C-alpha cells in the first residue's frame, strides 16, 4: 500500500531530466518560478506595459494561495516577457483561492471562490499592495447563494456584472452586481439553476449570445442554459457528454457553435451546439483526469488541456485525420500538436497569454509556476 507512489516519483524525476535536456529544441521560452504556496488558479490580466526603449514588456497574472493553516491571499504577479517574476499585490482571503477570474469589462474587478461557499469580489486597486497584518478579509462584495464550495466561475462578457458560479452543492448561482455599490455589501443570487443532480464542476457564458451559458457536472452531463427561460430546473439542452465526471468546458472564441469539455474519462470532447446528439471528436492522449480545457485566444483551431497526469497537451483540430508515418503515429494522433512535460505534479490551472501568441502560464500542486512558449517551428 502507497508504495507505487514512490516509483512513479522516480519515473517522474527521470522524464523531467529528459525534458530539461530537450527544452532548446521544443521551446522558444521557458521560465519556472516556485511560489511560496501552490496556486489553484491562474489567469493573465489583459493589459501589458511596454516601457520606453527596453527589450521586454510587463504582463500580469491573477494567482491565489492554497495554504495549510496559514493566512491565504489573492495574488497579482508581474512577469517580464521579451518582445523576472515578482508578486505585486497580496489581498487577505478567507481560505484558499479555489478560482479567481477578472471581469472582462473591468479587469480591476476579480471574483473568487472560497471554501466557505462565499463568492467574493475584490477591486484590487481599492486595497494596499501589502495585506492587512490582521489577516482579516475585506472583500468589496460578498455573493451569497451557495451551500457548499465550488470551482466554476464565469463573467458574462456581454452583460456587465452578470456572474455565474458552479458549486459542489449541485447548483449554479447567477448574480447581477452591476448596480450594487462595491462597499462590502452582501448580494444574494438573482437566479439559481438546479438542473444538475451532482457536483457542478464548471460553468461558462457563451462569448456572443448574452443569454446562453453551459455547465458540466459529475452527473456526466453538459447542459446548455438560456437565461430567458422561466424554468430554472431544466436546461435548454442536456447531453451525456462523457463516461465519467465532466470537470471543465470552454467555448471557442472564434467559432460560435463550437465548444470543448474535459473529463475524468481522460478525453476532451468537441461539440457543435446545432447538434448536441453527436459528439464531433474525442481527443485522446491524456493518461488521467482532465481538469482544465482552454481554447487559444489567437488561433481558432487550437485548444489545450491539462490535469492530473501532469501534462499539458495542445491540440490542432485542423489536423484531425491527417496521415502519419508509423514512427510519427507513435507519439499520438495527428491532432496532438505539442505535449508540455515541464511539470512534475498535477497541473491545477493554466492560462493562454492574450497578448503574446503561444505563451502559456501553467501552475501545479508542487508550487511551480511555468511561463512557456513552444518552438515556432512546431506551429509553423
Amino acid at each position: 500500500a502507497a508504495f507505487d507512489d514512490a516509483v512513479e516519483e522516480r519515473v517522474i524525476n527521470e522524464e523531467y531530466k529528459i525534458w530539461k535536456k530537450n527544452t532548446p529544441f521544443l521551446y522558444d521560452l521557458v521560465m519556472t518560478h516556485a511560489l511560496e504556496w501552490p496556486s489553484l488558479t491562474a489567469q493573465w490580466l489583459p493589459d501589458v506595459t511596454r516601457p520606453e526603449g527596453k527589450d521586454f514588456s510587463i504582463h500580469r497574472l491573477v494567482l491565489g494561495t492554497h495554504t495549510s493553516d496559514e493566512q491565504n491571499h489573492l495574488v497579482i504577479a508581474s512577469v517580464q516577457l521579451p518582445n523576472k517574476i515578482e508578486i505585486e499585490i497580496k489581498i487577505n482571503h478567507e481560505g484558499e483561492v479555489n478560482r479567481a477570474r477578472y471581469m472582462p469589462q473591468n479587469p480591476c474587478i476579480i471574483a473568487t471562490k472560497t471554501p466557505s461557499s462565499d463568492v467574493l469580489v475584490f477591486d484590487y486597486t481599492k486595497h494596499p499592495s501589502k495585506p492587512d497584518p490582521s489577516g482579516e478579509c475585506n472583500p468589496d462584495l460578498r455573493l451569497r447563494g451557495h451551500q457548499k464550495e465550488g470551482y466554476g466561475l464565469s463573467w458574462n462578457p456581454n452583460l456587465s456584472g452578470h456572474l455565474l458560479s458552479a458549486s459542489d452543492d449541485h447548483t449554479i448561482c447567477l448574480w447581477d452586481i452591476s448596480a450594487v455599490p462595491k462597499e462590502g455589501k452582501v448580494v444574494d443570487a438573482k437566479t439559481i439553476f438546479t438542473g444538475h443532480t451532482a457536483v457542478v464542476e464548471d460553468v461558462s457564458w457563451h462569448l456572443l449570445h448574452e443569454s446562453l451559458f453551459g455547465s458540466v457536472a459529475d452527473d456526466q452531463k453538459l447542459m446548455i442554459w438560456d437565461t430567458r427561460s422561466n424554468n430554472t430546473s431544466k436546461p435548454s439542452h442536456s447531453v451525456d457528454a462523457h463516461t465519467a465526471e465532466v470537470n471543465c468546458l470552454s467555448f471557442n472564441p472564434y467559432s460560435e457553435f463550437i465548444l470543448a469539455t474535459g473529463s475524468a474519462d481522460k478525453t476532451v470532447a468537441l461539440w457543435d451546439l446545432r447538434n448536441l446528439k453527436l459528439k464531433l471528436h474525442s481527443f485522446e492522449s491524456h493518461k488521467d483526469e482532465i481538469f482544465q480545457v482552454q481554447w487559444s485566444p489567437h488561433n481558432e483551431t487550437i485548444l489545450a488541456s491539462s490535469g492530473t497526469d501532469r501534462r499539458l497537451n495542445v491540440w490542432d483540430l485542423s489536423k484531425i485525420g491527417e496521415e502519419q508515418s508509423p514512427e510519427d503515429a507513435e507519439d499520438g494522433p495527428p491532432e496532438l500538436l505539442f505535449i508540455h512535460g515541464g511539470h512534475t505534479a498535477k497541473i491545477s490551472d493554466f492560462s493562454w497569454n492574450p497578448n503574446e501568441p503561444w505563451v502559456i502560464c501553467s501552475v501545479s500542486e508542487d508550487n511551480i509556476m511555468q511561463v512557456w512558449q513552444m518552438a515556432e517551428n512546431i506551429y509553423n
Binding site: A34, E36, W37, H66, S68, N98, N247, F291, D366
Partner: peptide, 10 residues
C-alpha cells in the same frame, strides 16, 4: 476531491 490534502510551503 480536486484539492490536495497537504499543500507545502517553500
Amino acid at each position: 476531491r480536486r484539492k490536495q490534502e497537504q499543500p507545502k510551503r517553500l
